[PDB]
Write a protein that binds this DNA or RNA. Structure first.
Lengths: 51, 51, 50, 103
RNA sequence: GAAGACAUUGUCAGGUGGGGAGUUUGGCUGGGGCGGCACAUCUGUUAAACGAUAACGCAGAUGUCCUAAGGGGGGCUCAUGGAGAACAGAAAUCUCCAGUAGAACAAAAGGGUAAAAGCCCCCUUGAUUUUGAUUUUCAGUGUGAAUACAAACCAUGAAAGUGUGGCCUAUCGAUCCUUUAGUCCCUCGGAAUUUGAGGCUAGAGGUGCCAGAAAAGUUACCACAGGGAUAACUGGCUUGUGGCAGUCAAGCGUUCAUAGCGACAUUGCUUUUUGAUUCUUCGAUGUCGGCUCUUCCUAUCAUACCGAAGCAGAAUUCGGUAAG
RNA sequence: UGACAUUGUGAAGAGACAUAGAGGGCUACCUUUAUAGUUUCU
RNA sequence: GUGAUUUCUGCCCAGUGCUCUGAAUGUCAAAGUGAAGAAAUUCAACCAAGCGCGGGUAAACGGCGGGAGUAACUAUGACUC
RNA sequence: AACUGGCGAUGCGGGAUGAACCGAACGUAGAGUUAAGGUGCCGGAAUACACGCUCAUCAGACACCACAAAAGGUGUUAGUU
RNA sequence: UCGAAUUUGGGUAUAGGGGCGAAAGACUAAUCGAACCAUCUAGUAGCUGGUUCCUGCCGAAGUUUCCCUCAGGAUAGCAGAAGCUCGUAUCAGUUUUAUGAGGUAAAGCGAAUGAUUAGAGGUUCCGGGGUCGAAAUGACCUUGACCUAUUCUCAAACUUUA
RNA sequence: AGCGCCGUGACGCAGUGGAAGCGCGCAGGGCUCAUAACCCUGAUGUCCUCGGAUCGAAACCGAGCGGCGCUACCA
RNA sequence: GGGUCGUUAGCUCAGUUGGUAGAGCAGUUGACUUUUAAUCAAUUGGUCGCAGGUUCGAAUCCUGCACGACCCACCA
RNA sequence: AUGAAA
């Protein structure tokens, strides 16, 4: 027949996620020394909508 | 073309198939035999013939 | 609602799937349109039971 | 059809050349050897891509086989074949045909 | 940090796999499809008194069956009817007379047969080997079936004789492959032995579309080469069917077959229906109805003039010249 | 999915293969038991 | 897959699919093991998944019957087979 | 479908007209004689000879061929008893 | 239909069994049930069309058998050409004499088989019975069988004859 | 128009050449004051009709009679 | 508009394919009962819609004739 | 389990 929608969404020309209005990844800070031997202080400076 | 629905006789299992009306389909050579019955041993039925 | 070229449900003078939509996990890429690796179907009546 | 177990028939056996007694037996089609040239060629022919390569027959009609015999001379042990007509039911153990009997 | 000789990756083998690929999807045919087999065959008839002879012509049949239902020999004669014989009657078993076949011979049908080819009894496996010749279908090719001999070995019979399957007409299968029997023969090609493999002669395993491919559909999205060899419009021959008009008159009509009707029967006409055929047209005749508009036929609905009436008048029915 | 290779270093069980003894319908099993080696699942 | 809201989604897991068992003399490839043979090779056992066996599943594909008799008019048939 | 002869492949003379019917099969010409068909005019050939039938207010006119039937008529002619 | 699932420029991505599709098999440069270009390729065709000067001589077939064979081939036949061996006969789409074979036309059914019309005359140990009567293989009457000779019509799968 | 199926007691439905099955219905006895139910018993099927083959069929093959089913497309 | 089927007691239904109308419901009388109902017995009704052949002879054989019950009916 | 009308 012909390729079908999921079978083209894998290849992903027009189905790639949109990225212009995102703040990057949301992640936990790296487990370097402090989070596995003690703690560290941080300041929530702001809160923001992610698109 | 003919749809056929038939009962497996030694098992009791339905079997539906279909194939054109003019193509060849195999048939076995079924036979009934009317056997008399005597004293039943372990699970094997016990039937005799006239000769 | 598609054509039979465009999907494994498509075509027919009536909008009907025709061949059952419950698809094996060991199917292939091209056949896995529909309900995939399903254990039961229909309306559940009761509890998720977990 | 029915046949006895022994038969008086010609034996071209280089000492009989006359009517001797012959033990009859059926002909069984015989187990197939590998390494016969057809099977060797066929395994080579099917080796690899191309799918099926020789025909294979399904449009079948005959519901009977010809029955065929082996004739073992009592003196020479010289086997011999002779063929008979087509029969659905065949038998060598012969309960004779008694004419004067009931149903 | 995790995980650890597992995973992974490589190569083979088993499965699943229209997701994808390749290919096929018989023939005959009063168009094709459904149906059927007239596709391999057999009997009788069509078939026109040698032979041959068609159609989806008629009535049927075959893909099987028999160690006897084959071969020989001997003894009897069948179906049916009449007259009897307890139970026993229409039909149980026995006897006599007639009994040219009216029975039986594996089956379909047709031939054939009466000290037999039928029924019973006795003995057997000629339903065996070597291969050639001949007939039928016929290309005088093959397959199948059958005929008559030769060389052997046998059966049966007192013997002449008869016997190579079934009383005759049908009952079946090439190459390649597999397998078996015979010769225990040939070869395996640097020389040997032994396994194994390949050869010669003769059979089976099967192609029923039966001189023998290995094979499902759809397309109204459709494509191509063609076809009036082939359908659906119109026309043409035909008119069953549709319609119209006659001949006869059992009866209806108060009395009376005919004023008007006219059963049972039958002869015609028309092509306005609907079939049948396939002559023309498939390198296209634009295909139903309505609207418009002309013209023609009469088997006249009305109007003109008439005839008949179960026509008093009125109204009506039948009929003639008549398509103005 | 399985086998081999990749792929080296360790053990703790269990199942079966042959020998002998008890419970069983001249005697075949099945239930068990004790052996020197052999394979295989965890 | 179905197509706002309201109301409501009945019965059928036999078939085809999907999925979960393994407690099994079924089937069971290659590699590997044993026996025979002088070897090619043959034969036997074992045996992964799958298939077979058995559960679940219909807002999965889909499916959802006939015949009789009977009521104080007759007809009809609550009822019964 | 059978037998034969033709048409296809075949002109000429006739059937007005026509693949097949009838006559006859073909070199180029001349002279005669015929076939089948015809002789009022078209049209070459007798409006010939002879014996009768028919008047039709839808005559009839020459094979295949181009239609016409059952049933009737004090029309008319010739007959039978 | 018109403030939006709105309309639009430019850049940019997705490429042919692939893309893209608010889904029509629509769009993919006037091309879409698989674009366009070039080659393989002078692809294949049992199918259609066409197939080039003159004259002379001879001159057909649409039939047999087999073929996934029915618009085509192979084969045999029909027909040309090359001739070869001999020279009036080892011939004839013919008649006559003699001898065979056929079972169609026609004919027949008081001849077999099958079908068929109607009577009479009998046999009733004889089918149904109606009567005389207790009944009686006793008696009578009627009505279907059977028997006798008769009559009418028939047969592609009936036949003496022919 | 063409093809196929089916006809079993009163009713429904099985039925295989050696010879009819089940359930309901029906009848009789017993319990019951009576019927139902219940317990003990028994019976009824030219197997549509005709013919044929067969030693013999309900079955197997023609005829008819009846009740149904399937085809009916491309124009 | 034709092709088929049938019009049976007051109601309904077999009929017998040819010689005689049968069954049920209904009604009338009787039995039963204190009288009824139901139940049991007996009779009642029948040219079976108009003419033909006519089996000796006809409702049913079938020919037409008035009532009904089904099946068909441009065409591209 | 049921038990007609006055």
């Amino acid at each position: 027949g012909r390729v079908i929608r999921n079978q083209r969404k894998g290849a992903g020309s027009i189905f790639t996620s949109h990225t212009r209005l995102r703040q990057g990844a949301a992640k936990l800070r790296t487990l370097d020394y402090a989070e596995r031997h003690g703690y560290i202080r941080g300041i929530v400076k702001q809160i923001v909508h992610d698109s | 073309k003919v749809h056929l629905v038939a009962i497996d006789i030694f098992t009791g299992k339905k079997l539906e198939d279909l194939s054109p009306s003019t193509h060849n389909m195999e048939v076995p050579v079924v036979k009934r035999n009317e056997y008399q019955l005597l004293d039943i041993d372990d699970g094997f039925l016990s039937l005799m013939n006239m000769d | 609602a598609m054509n039979p070229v465009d999907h494994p449900h498509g075509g027919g003078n009536h909008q009907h799937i025709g061949k059952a939509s419950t698809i094996s996990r060991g199917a292939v890429s091209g056949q896995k349109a529909g309900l995939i690796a399903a254990r039961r179907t229909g309306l559940l009546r009761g509890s998720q039971k977990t | 059809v029915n046949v006895p177990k022994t038969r008086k028939t010609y034996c071209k056996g280089k000492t009989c050349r006359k009517h001797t007694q012959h033990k009859v037996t059926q002909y069984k089609a015989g187990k197939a050897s590998l390494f016969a040239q057809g099977k060797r060629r066929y395994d080579r022919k099917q080796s690899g891509f191309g799918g099926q390569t020789k025909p294979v027959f399904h449009k079948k009609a005959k519901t009977t086989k010809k029955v065929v015999l082996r004739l073992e001379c009592v003196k020479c042990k010289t086997r011999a074949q002779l063929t008979l007509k087509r029969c659905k039911h065949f038998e060598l153990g012969g309960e004779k045909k008694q004419k004067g009997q009931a149903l």
